[PDB]
PDB file of C-alpha atoms in Angstrom:
ATOM      1  CA  UNK A  10    -190.450  43.748 -51.849  1.00 26.10           C
ATOM      2  CA  UNK A  11    -191.311  47.339 -52.331  1.00 24.04           C
ATOM      3  CA  UNK A  12    -188.944  50.270 -52.182  1.00 22.29           C
ATOM      4  CA  UNK A  13    -189.485  54.010 -51.665  1.00 24.95           C
ATOM      5  CA  UNK A  14    -188.107  55.789 -54.809  1.00 24.52           C
ATOM      6  CA  UNK A  15    -188.908  59.675 -53.838  1.00 25.78           C
ATOM      7  CA  UNK A  16    -190.713  61.139 -50.930  1.00 26.25           C
ATOM      8  CA  UNK A  17    -191.661  64.952 -51.459  1.00 25.42           C
ATOM      9  CA  UNK A  18    -194.569  67.340 -51.070  1.00 24.68           C
ATOM     10  CA  UNK A  19    -196.814  68.797 -53.728  1.00 25.64           C
ATOM     11  CA  UNK A  20    -200.068  70.879 -53.463  1.00 29.60           C
ATOM     12  CA  UNK A  21    -203.153  69.083 -55.083  1.00 30.99           C
ATOM     13  CA  UNK A  22    -204.843  71.205 -57.618  1.00 34.10           C
ATOM     14  CA  UNK A  23    -208.548  69.868 -58.272  1.00 34.59           C
ATOM     15  CA  UNK A  24    -208.899  72.427 -61.296  1.00 37.71           C
ATOM     16  CA  UNK A  25    -205.870  73.768 -62.985  1.00 37.14           C
ATOM     17  CA  UNK A  26    -208.067  76.739 -64.403  1.00 36.62           C
ATOM     18  CA  UNK A  27    -208.971  78.360 -61.412  1.00 34.99           C
ATOM     19  CA  UNK A  28    -206.861  80.089 -58.715  1.00 33.11           C
ATOM     20  CA  UNK A  29    -206.425  78.894 -55.129  1.00 30.67           C
ATOM     21  CA  UNK A  30    -204.948  80.030 -51.944  1.00 31.47           C
ATOM     22  CA  UNK A  31    -201.103  79.275 -51.641  1.00 31.42           C
ATOM     23  CA  UNK A  32    -200.337  76.166 -49.482  1.00 30.49           C
ATOM     24  CA  UNK A  33    -203.912  74.788 -49.895  1.00 30.29           C
ATOM     25  CA  UNK A  34    -204.360  70.952 -50.425  1.00 26.96           C
ATOM     26  CA  UNK A  35    -200.812  69.996 -49.425  1.00 27.99           C
ATOM     27  CA  UNK A  36    -199.872  66.428 -49.693  1.00 27.65           C
ATOM     28  CA  UNK A  37    -197.355  63.965 -48.601  1.00 30.71           C
ATOM     29  CA  UNK A  38    -196.170  62.255 -51.694  1.00 31.83           C
ATOM     30  CA  UNK A  39    -194.814  58.900 -51.536  1.00 32.52           C
ATOM     31  CA  UNK A  40    -193.581  57.153 -54.751  1.00 30.38           C
ATOM     32  CA  UNK A  41    -192.666  53.673 -54.463  1.00 29.87           C
ATOM     33  CA  UNK A  42    -191.174  51.294 -57.177  1.00 32.86           C
ATOM     34  CA  UNK A  43    -194.502  49.877 -57.842  1.00 33.87           C
ATOM     35  CA  UNK A  44    -197.110  52.468 -56.487  1.00 34.22           C
ATOM     36  CA  UNK A  45    -197.835  56.372 -55.944  1.00 32.51           C
ATOM     37  CA  UNK A  46    -199.549  57.366 -52.482  1.00 32.06           C
ATOM     38  CA  UNK A  47    -201.043  60.528 -51.867  1.00 30.32           C
ATOM     39  CA  UNK A  48    -202.149  61.724 -48.380  1.00 33.39           C
ATOM     40  CA  UNK A  49    -202.900  64.676 -45.984  1.00 30.87           C
ATOM     41  CA  UNK A  50    -199.828  66.387 -44.324  1.00 33.04           C
ATOM     42  CA  UNK A  51    -198.644  65.246 -40.940  1.00 31.83           C
ATOM     43  CA  UNK A  52    -199.543  66.849 -37.470  1.00 32.45           C
ATOM     44  CA  UNK A  56    -198.984  63.168 -31.885  1.00 34.43           C
ATOM     45  CA  UNK A  57    -202.329  61.202 -32.314  1.00 35.62           C
ATOM     46  CA  UNK A  58    -204.104  58.165 -33.615  1.00 34.84           C
ATOM     47  CA  UNK A  59    -206.263  59.447 -36.478  1.00 34.57           C
ATOM     48  CA  UNK A  60    -208.118  58.055 -39.571  1.00 32.34           C
ATOM     49  CA  UNK A  61    -206.835  59.806 -42.502  1.00 32.07           C
ATOM     50  CA  UNK A  62    -207.434  59.710 -46.263  1.00 35.34           C
ATOM     51  CA  UNK A  63    -205.331  57.927 -48.745  1.00 35.05           C
ATOM     52  CA  UNK A  64    -205.092  58.003 -52.697  1.00 34.71           C
ATOM     53  CA  UNK A  65    -203.074  55.178 -53.855  1.00 36.73           C
ATOM     54  CA  UNK A  66    -202.434  54.834 -57.816  1.00 35.76           C
ATOM     55  CA  UNK A  67    -201.200  51.905 -59.846  1.00 35.03           C
ATOM     56  CA  UNK A  68    -198.495  52.820 -62.160  1.00 35.68           C
ATOM     57  CA  UNK A  69    -199.572  50.594 -64.822  1.00 36.10           C
ATOM     58  CA  UNK A  70    -200.829  52.975 -67.570  1.00 37.05           C
ATOM     59  CA  UNK A  71    -199.948  56.296 -65.879  1.00 34.07           C
ATOM     60  CA  UNK A  72    -199.002  59.055 -67.882  1.00 33.09           C
ATOM     61  CA  UNK A  73    -197.253  62.332 -66.912  1.00 33.22           C
ATOM     62  CA  UNK A  74    -198.324  65.689 -68.351  1.00 31.79           C
ATOM     63  CA  UNK A  75    -196.047  68.689 -67.355  1.00 32.72           C
ATOM     64  CA  UNK A  76    -197.812  72.129 -67.529  1.00 33.98           C
ATOM     65  CA  UNK A  77    -197.660  75.640 -66.658  1.00 35.36           C
ATOM     66  CA  UNK A  78    -200.240  78.624 -66.345  1.00 30.82           C
ATOM     67  CA  UNK A  79    -200.461  81.777 -64.618  1.00 30.06           C
ATOM     68  CA  UNK A  80    -201.868  80.109 -61.606  1.00 30.38           C
ATOM     69  CA  UNK A  81    -200.005  76.866 -61.433  1.00 29.62           C
ATOM     70  CA  UNK A  82    -196.434  77.310 -62.723  1.00 30.74           C
ATOM     71  CA  UNK A  83    -195.142  73.958 -61.996  1.00 28.63           C
ATOM     72  CA  UNK A  84    -197.839  71.680 -63.111  1.00 27.20           C
ATOM     73  CA  UNK A  85    -198.193  68.021 -63.188  1.00 30.77           C
ATOM     74  CA  UNK A  86    -201.159  66.142 -64.797  1.00 31.47           C
ATOM     75  CA  UNK A  87    -201.582  62.460 -64.151  1.00 30.66           C
ATOM     76  CA  UNK A  88    -203.607  60.305 -66.379  1.00 30.76           C
ATOM     77  CA  UNK A  89    -204.642  56.728 -66.480  1.00 28.92           C
ATOM     78  CA  UNK A  90    -204.322  55.315 -70.069  1.00 27.00           C
ATOM     79  CA  UNK A  91    -205.088  51.724 -70.807  1.00 27.91           C
ATOM     80  CA  UNK A  92    -206.146  49.595 -74.200  1.00 31.73           C
ATOM     81  CA  UNK A  93    -209.800  49.818 -74.803  1.00 30.13           C
ATOM     82  CA  UNK A  94    -210.717  52.493 -72.008  1.00 29.88           C
ATOM     83  CA  UNK A  95    -211.395  56.220 -71.958  1.00 30.63           C
ATOM     84  CA  UNK A  96    -208.438  58.072 -70.649  1.00 28.90           C
ATOM     85  CA  UNK A  97    -209.107  59.065 -67.037  1.00 26.90           C
ATOM     86  CA  UNK A  98    -207.565  62.187 -65.355  1.00 25.11           C
ATOM     87  CA  UNK A  99    -206.199  60.783 -62.008  1.00 25.06           C
ATOM     88  CA  UNK A 100    -204.797  64.062 -60.175  1.00 23.22           C
ATOM     89  CA  UNK A 101    -203.342  67.382 -60.853  1.00 27.03           C
ATOM     90  CA  UNK A 102    -200.479  68.740 -58.675  1.00 29.11           C
ATOM     91  CA  UNK A 103    -198.328  71.808 -58.428  1.00 26.56           C
ATOM     92  CA  UNK A 104    -194.654  71.482 -57.299  1.00 22.37           C
ATOM     93  CA  UNK A 105    -193.078  74.093 -55.130  1.00 19.89           C
ATOM     94  CA  UNK A 106    -190.299  74.825 -57.497  1.00 17.93           C
ATOM     95  CA  UNK A 107    -189.101  73.173 -60.968  1.00 19.23           C
ATOM     96  CA  UNK A 108    -186.230  71.329 -59.418  1.00 20.17           C
ATOM     97  CA  UNK A 109    -188.686  69.202 -57.485  1.00 19.28           C
ATOM     98  CA  UNK A 110    -191.015  68.954 -60.505  1.00 20.08           C
ATOM     99  CA  UNK A 111    -188.162  67.621 -62.751  1.00 21.72           C
ATOM    100  CA  UNK A 112    -186.908  65.357 -60.095  1.00 23.16           C
ATOM    101  CA  UNK A 113    -190.293  63.764 -59.029  1.00 22.77           C
ATOM    102  CA  UNK A 114    -191.718  63.359 -62.435  1.00 22.98           C
ATOM    103  CA  UNK A 115    -188.316  61.871 -63.673  1.00 18.25           C
ATOM    104  CA  UNK A 116    -188.503  59.239 -60.641  1.00 16.63           C
ATOM    105  CA  UNK A 117    -192.057  58.726 -61.568  1.00 17.55           C
ATOM    106  CA  UNK A 118    -191.554  57.916 -65.347  1.00 17.26           C
ATOM    107  CA  UNK A 119    -188.606  55.492 -64.535  1.00 18.18           C
ATOM    108  CA  UNK A 120    -191.022  53.770 -62.109  1.00 20.00           C
ATOM    109  CA  UNK A 121    -193.937  53.624 -64.555  1.00 21.32           C
ATOM    110  CA  UNK A 122    -191.319  52.045 -67.189  1.00 19.16           C
ATOM    111  CA  UNK A 123    -190.327  49.302 -64.603  1.00 21.19           C
ATOM    112  CA  UNK A 124    -193.889  48.487 -63.827  1.00 21.32           C
ATOM    113  CA  UNK A 125    -194.693  48.236 -67.634  1.00 22.30           C
ATOM    114  CA  UNK A 126    -191.875  45.972 -68.261  1.00 21.12           C
ATOM    115  CA  UNK A 127    -192.891  43.755 -65.232  1.00 19.21           C
ATOM    116  CA  UNK A 128    -196.596  43.598 -66.343  1.00 17.73           C
ATOM    117  CA  UNK A 129    -195.433  42.972 -69.953  1.00 16.48           C
ATOM    118  CA  UNK A 130    -193.321  40.106 -68.883  1.00 16.31           C
ATOM    119  CA  UNK A 131    -196.451  38.829 -66.749  1.00 19.10           C
ATOM    120  CA  UNK A 132    -198.833  39.101 -69.486  1.00 15.76           C
ATOM    121  CA  UNK A 133    -196.836  37.414 -71.988  1.00 13.09           C
ATOM    122  CA  UNK A 134    -195.841  34.543 -69.552  1.00 11.83           C
ATOM    123  CA  UNK A 135    -199.350  33.898 -68.889  1.00 11.98           C
ATOM    124  CA  UNK A 136    -200.114  33.569 -72.653  1.00 10.46           C
ATOM    125  CA  UNK A 137    -197.217  31.128 -72.961  1.00  8.38           C
ATOM    126  CA  UNK A 138    -198.774  28.819 -70.475  1.00  6.62           C
ATOM    127  CA  UNK A 139    -201.967  28.355 -72.565  1.00  3.74           C
TER     128      UNK A 139
ATOM    129  CA  UNK B  10    -189.206  72.059 -43.295  1.00 10.12           C
ATOM    130  CA  UNK B  11    -189.641  68.332 -42.551  1.00 12.14           C
ATOM    131  CA  UNK B  12    -187.111  65.560 -43.920  1.00 11.12           C
ATOM    132  CA  UNK B  13    -187.571  61.877 -44.257  1.00 12.07           C
ATOM    133  CA  UNK B  14    -184.919  60.011 -42.383  1.00 12.16           C
ATOM    134  CA  UNK B  15    -185.858  56.339 -42.853  1.00 12.10           C
ATOM    135  CA  UNK B  16    -188.677  54.432 -44.411  1.00 11.17           C
ATOM    136  CA  UNK B  17    -188.876  50.791 -43.371  1.00  6.42           C
ATOM    137  CA  UNK B  18    -191.253  48.244 -42.372  1.00  2.66           C
ATOM    138  CA  UNK B  19    -191.989  46.682 -38.875  1.00  2.31           C
ATOM    139  CA  UNK B  20    -194.414  44.344 -37.341  1.00  2.00           C
ATOM    140  CA  UNK B  21    -196.120  45.866 -34.437  1.00  2.00           C
ATOM    141  CA  UNK B  22    -196.320  43.670 -31.338  1.00  2.00           C
ATOM    142  CA  UNK B  23    -199.200  44.753 -28.843  1.00  2.00           C
ATOM    143  CA  UNK B  24    -197.893  42.053 -26.298  1.00  5.13           C
ATOM    144  CA  UNK B  25    -194.175  41.040 -26.271  1.00  2.61           C
ATOM    145  CA  UNK B  26    -194.825  38.042 -24.010  1.00  3.52           C
ATOM    146  CA  UNK B  27    -197.354  36.274 -26.348  1.00  2.00           C
ATOM    147  CA  UNK B  28    -196.622  34.676 -29.598  1.00  2.00           C
ATOM    148  CA  UNK B  29    -198.333  35.943 -32.736  1.00  2.00           C
ATOM    149  CA  UNK B  30    -198.579  34.858 -36.322  1.00  2.00           C
ATOM    150  CA  UNK B  31    -195.563  35.769 -38.835  1.00  2.00           C
ATOM    151  CA  UNK B  32    -196.261  38.743 -40.746  1.00  2.00           C
ATOM    152  CA  UNK B  33    -199.199  40.134 -38.487  1.00  2.00           C
ATOM    153  CA  UNK B  34    -199.548  43.886 -37.880  1.00  2.00           C
ATOM    154  CA  UNK B  35    -197.153  44.919 -40.529  1.00  2.00           C
ATOM    155  CA  UNK B  36    -196.581  48.527 -40.673  1.00  2.00           C
ATOM    156  CA  UNK B  37    -195.143  51.268 -42.886  1.00  2.00           C
ATOM    157  CA  UNK B  38    -192.837  53.160 -40.793  1.00  2.00           C
ATOM    158  CA  UNK B  39    -191.708  56.834 -41.656  1.00  2.00           C
ATOM    159  CA  UNK B  40    -189.219  58.258 -39.519  1.00  2.00           C
ATOM    160  CA  UNK B  41    -188.783  62.093 -40.170  1.00  2.00           C
ATOM    161  CA  UNK B  42    -186.264  64.530 -38.573  1.00  2.00           C
ATOM    162  CA  UNK B  43    -189.155  65.589 -36.119  1.00  2.00           C
ATOM    163  CA  UNK B  44    -191.782  62.835 -36.194  1.00  2.00           C
ATOM    164  CA  UNK B  45    -192.466  59.234 -36.246  1.00  2.00           C
ATOM    165  CA  UNK B  46    -195.469  57.826 -38.129  1.00  2.00           C
ATOM    166  CA  UNK B  47    -196.737  54.572 -38.247  1.00  2.00           C
ATOM    167  CA  UNK B  48    -199.457  53.159 -40.480  1.00  2.00           C
ATOM    168  CA  UNK B  49    -201.179  50.163 -42.113  1.00  2.00           C
ATOM    169  CA  UNK B  50    -199.390  48.710 -45.067  1.00  2.00           C
ATOM    170  CA  UNK B  51    -200.279  49.740 -48.735  1.00  2.76           C
ATOM    171  CA  UNK B  52    -202.634  47.975 -51.269  1.00  5.35           C
ATOM    172  CA  UNK B  56    -205.536  51.679 -56.053  1.00  3.80           C
ATOM    173  CA  UNK B  57    -208.047  53.397 -54.102  1.00  2.78           C
ATOM    174  CA  UNK B  58    -209.250  56.338 -51.943  1.00  6.09           C
ATOM    175  CA  UNK B  59    -209.558  54.952 -48.346  1.00  8.09           C
ATOM    176  CA  UNK B  60    -209.633  56.153 -44.800  1.00  6.24           C
ATOM    177  CA  UNK B  61    -206.661  54.361 -43.051  1.00  6.93           C
ATOM    178  CA  UNK B  62    -205.162  54.397 -39.529  1.00  5.78           C
ATOM    179  CA  UNK B  63    -202.306  56.578 -38.671  1.00  5.45           C
ATOM    180  CA  UNK B  64    -200.084  56.714 -35.289  1.00  4.52           C
ATOM    181  CA  UNK B  65    -197.854  59.741 -35.181  1.00  7.12           C
ATOM    182  CA  UNK B  66    -195.378  60.279 -32.370  1.00 10.02           C
ATOM    183  CA  UNK B  67    -193.492  63.227 -31.131  1.00  9.92           C
ATOM    184  CA  UNK B  68    -189.915  62.259 -30.639  1.00 10.19           C
ATOM    185  CA  UNK B  69    -189.644  64.840 -27.526  1.00  9.12           C
ATOM    186  CA  UNK B  70    -188.847  62.471 -24.649  1.00  9.39           C
ATOM    187  CA  UNK B  71    -188.798  59.256 -26.569  1.00  9.91           C
ATOM    188  CA  UNK B  72    -186.725  56.513 -25.479  1.00  8.72           C
ATOM    189  CA  UNK B  73    -185.889  53.298 -27.421  1.00  9.89           C
ATOM    190  CA  UNK B  74    -185.066  49.958 -25.579  1.00 11.10           C
ATOM    191  CA  UNK B  75    -183.858  47.025 -27.542  1.00 11.78           C
ATOM    192  CA  UNK B  76    -185.159  43.652 -26.612  1.00 10.43           C
ATOM    193  CA  UNK B  77    -185.060  39.939 -27.742  1.00 12.66           C
ATOM    194  CA  UNK B  78    -187.055  36.975 -26.576  1.00 13.29           C
ATOM    195  CA  UNK B  79    -188.126  33.643 -28.105  1.00 12.21           C
ATOM    196  CA  UNK B  80    -191.196  35.087 -29.919  1.00 12.76           C
ATOM    197  CA  UNK B  81    -189.798  38.195 -31.139  1.00 12.48           C
ATOM    198  CA  UNK B  82    -186.128  38.116 -31.573  1.00 12.44           C
ATOM    199  CA  UNK B  83    -185.648  41.793 -33.033  1.00 12.49           C
ATOM    200  CA  UNK B  84    -187.598  43.707 -30.680  1.00 11.82           C
ATOM    201  CA  UNK B  85    -187.918  47.468 -30.073  1.00 15.68           C
ATOM    202  CA  UNK B  86    -189.717  49.080 -27.359  1.00 12.71           C
ATOM    203  CA  UNK B  87    -190.682  52.848 -27.574  1.00 11.80           C
ATOM    204  CA  UNK B  88    -191.692  54.762 -24.462  1.00 12.72           C
ATOM    205  CA  UNK B  89    -192.376  58.281 -23.741  1.00 15.06           C
ATOM    206  CA  UNK B  90    -190.250  59.761 -20.459  1.00 17.41           C
ATOM    207  CA  UNK B  91    -190.984  63.484 -19.575  1.00 16.62           C
ATOM    208  CA  UNK B  92    -190.307  65.243 -16.256  1.00 18.91           C
ATOM    209  CA  UNK B  93    -193.110  65.066 -13.820  1.00 17.63           C
ATOM    210  CA  UNK B  94    -195.030  62.363 -15.775  1.00 15.80           C
ATOM    211  CA  UNK B  95    -195.400  58.587 -15.638  1.00 13.76           C
ATOM    212  CA  UNK B  96    -193.413  56.846 -18.251  1.00 16.32           C
ATOM    213  CA  UNK B  97    -195.854  55.468 -20.962  1.00 16.64           C
ATOM    214  CA  UNK B  98    -195.298  52.696 -23.414  1.00 12.11           C
ATOM    215  CA  UNK B  99    -195.976  53.766 -26.810  1.00 10.11           C
ATOM    216  CA  UNK B 100    -195.498  50.977 -29.079  1.00 13.34           C
ATOM    217  CA  UNK B 101    -193.641  47.584 -29.261  1.00 14.65           C
ATOM    218  CA  UNK B 102    -192.303  46.578 -32.794  1.00 20.41           C
ATOM    219  CA  UNK B 103    -190.157  43.675 -34.210  1.00 18.56           C
ATOM    220  CA  UNK B 104    -187.821  44.165 -37.094  1.00 15.22           C
ATOM    221  CA  UNK B 105    -187.578  41.605 -39.998  1.00 15.26           C
ATOM    222  CA  UNK B 106    -183.828  41.282 -39.296  1.00 12.74           C
ATOM    223  CA  UNK B 107    -181.322  42.956 -36.903  1.00 11.24           C
ATOM    224  CA  UNK B 108    -179.488  45.095 -39.763  1.00 10.86           C
ATOM    225  CA  UNK B 109    -182.842  46.892 -40.119  1.00 12.52           C
ATOM    226  CA  UNK B 110    -183.208  46.969 -36.338  1.00 12.82           C
ATOM    227  CA  UNK B 111    -179.817  48.599 -35.763  1.00 12.98           C
ATOM    228  CA  UNK B 112    -180.326  50.828 -38.779  1.00 13.53           C
ATOM    229  CA  UNK B 113    -183.702  52.317 -37.751  1.00 12.23           C
ATOM    230  CA  UNK B 114    -183.117  52.574 -34.065  1.00 11.65           C
ATOM    231  CA  UNK B 115    -179.848  54.394 -34.859  1.00 11.46           C
ATOM    232  CA  UNK B 116    -181.652  56.875 -37.109  1.00 10.82           C
ATOM    233  CA  UNK B 117    -184.181  57.074 -34.410  1.00  8.68           C
ATOM    234  CA  UNK B 118    -181.944  58.041 -31.502  1.00 10.24           C
ATOM    235  CA  UNK B 119    -180.012  60.826 -33.878  1.00  9.75           C
ATOM    236  CA  UNK B 120    -183.559  62.145 -34.563  1.00  9.68           C
ATOM    237  CA  UNK B 121    -184.509  62.136 -31.110  1.00  6.96           C
ATOM    238  CA  UNK B 122    -181.321  64.020 -30.015  1.00  8.37           C
ATOM    239  CA  UNK B 123    -181.977  66.680 -32.632  1.00  8.31           C
ATOM    240  CA  UNK B 124    -185.280  67.246 -31.424  1.00  5.10           C
ATOM    241  CA  UNK B 125    -184.086  67.326 -27.663  1.00  2.48           C
ATOM    242  CA  UNK B 126    -181.751  70.001 -28.688  1.00  2.55           C
ATOM    243  CA  UNK B 127    -184.113  72.172 -30.698  1.00  2.00           C
ATOM    244  CA  UNK B 128    -186.529  72.042 -27.833  1.00  2.00           C
ATOM    245  CA  UNK B 129    -183.853  72.922 -25.223  1.00  2.00           C
ATOM    246  CA  UNK B 130    -182.891  75.860 -27.290  1.00  2.00           C
ATOM    247  CA  UNK B 131    -186.630  77.077 -27.591  1.00  2.00           C
ATOM    248  CA  UNK B 132    -187.331  76.549 -23.807  1.00  2.00           C
ATOM    249  CA  UNK B 133    -184.328  78.252 -22.759  1.00  2.00           C
ATOM    250  CA  UNK B 134    -185.020  81.216 -25.202  1.00  2.00           C
ATOM    251  CA  UNK B 135    -188.401  81.536 -23.910  1.00  2.00           C
ATOM    252  CA  UNK B 136    -187.051  82.036 -20.322  1.00  2.00           C
ATOM    253  CA  UNK B 137    -184.659  84.503 -21.600  1.00  2.00           C
ATOM    254  CA  UNK B 138    -187.582  86.434 -23.004  1.00  2.00           C
ATOM    255  CA  UNK B 139    -189.236  86.707 -19.444  1.00  2.00           C
TER     256      UNK B 139
END
């Protein structure tokens, strides 16, 4: 039982230190209760398109602003025993969208953390 | 300015006269105000996945029920001067979902028809 929490659009930013053309790397962003999916914008046709999906377990959201990306969002994966990975950087069209999306995202991260906690603790109680 | 009208899940039905295993050909369905997008369910990873997009201009919705597909939806493309094309058949999990989705779809079809009407009539007024 999956549920869509937020649909929006964000520009992907492969390098938050370098400028890039306005409107480049636009993405359809689908935030579900237990997944984040990123894909190319939508054109009819039957095509094979690119699809980044990210687990919400261990995901952290960092808000950032610089002269080239005034509505930054950096997503990283941080789990016990591993190096922190940078998953993807975005820039939102406006801060309203930024606030909104990242707020929904954190909430959904917290939901996944607690479900996974209960699962892990439940397994241990079996043994 | 695109807007998500309805996210839901439907089973694709390549042949509404033949039975098929429960849960087969599940699809993520995204209904926008000016587009319908169908794609494979969601698993993290970076993958190349299949994507059917359909224009809403000239789309017609036929509700159907038989012994193998009790919540049928047939979509066809009907424009002036062309043979009618069958675009895709679905089966909804339950009639609540069927009613809801198809109601949103018709509404969005009507919106596209009227926007396109205004565009066509506007072009003619130029000439």
